[PDB]
RNA sequence: UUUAA
């Protein structure tokens, strides 16, 4: 077909949404966090990981059925590296008679032996 | 002690 215009940009700036939401970098960028205190969110599970890399996206999870914290959440980097280097800095951080659990995310990669 | 809420 032939070109036409552009219709000039949506907001002339950032775009206009209801939330933030969550997404993803590259593989294996993503993490996850575990044996956290109900004191952690979304913002600062966030600082904790922002001094680790370029940090896209995080999030702690709730419950819809009381609202409070599952004791644990979601990460994601731009790159790996930073993401790996995340795991290893704050996997075993004693904290309360626990111990944070750090782990990658799940992937079809890593579904089967192949 | 764990994978979208």
């Known amino acids: 077909m032939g070109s036409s215009h552009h219709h000039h940009h949506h907001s002339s700036g950032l775009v206009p949404r209801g939330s933030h939401m969550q997404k ?10 575990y044996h956290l205190p109900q004191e952690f969110g979304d913002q600062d599970i966030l600082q904790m990981f922002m001094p680790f890399g370029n940090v ?7 419950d819809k059925q009381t ?7 979601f990460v994601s980097y731009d790159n790996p590296v930073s993401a790996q280097a995340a795991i290893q800095a704050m996997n075993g951080f004693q904290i309360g008679m626990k111990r944070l659990k750090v ?12």
């Open 103 to 114: 782990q990658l995310k799940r992937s079809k990669n890593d579904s089967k032996p192949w």
């Open 24 to 33: 993803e970098g590259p593989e294996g960028a993503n993490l996850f966090i």
């Open 67 to 73: 609202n409070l914290s599952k004791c644990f959440g």
């Open 56 to 62: 896209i996206s995080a999030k702690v999870f709730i």
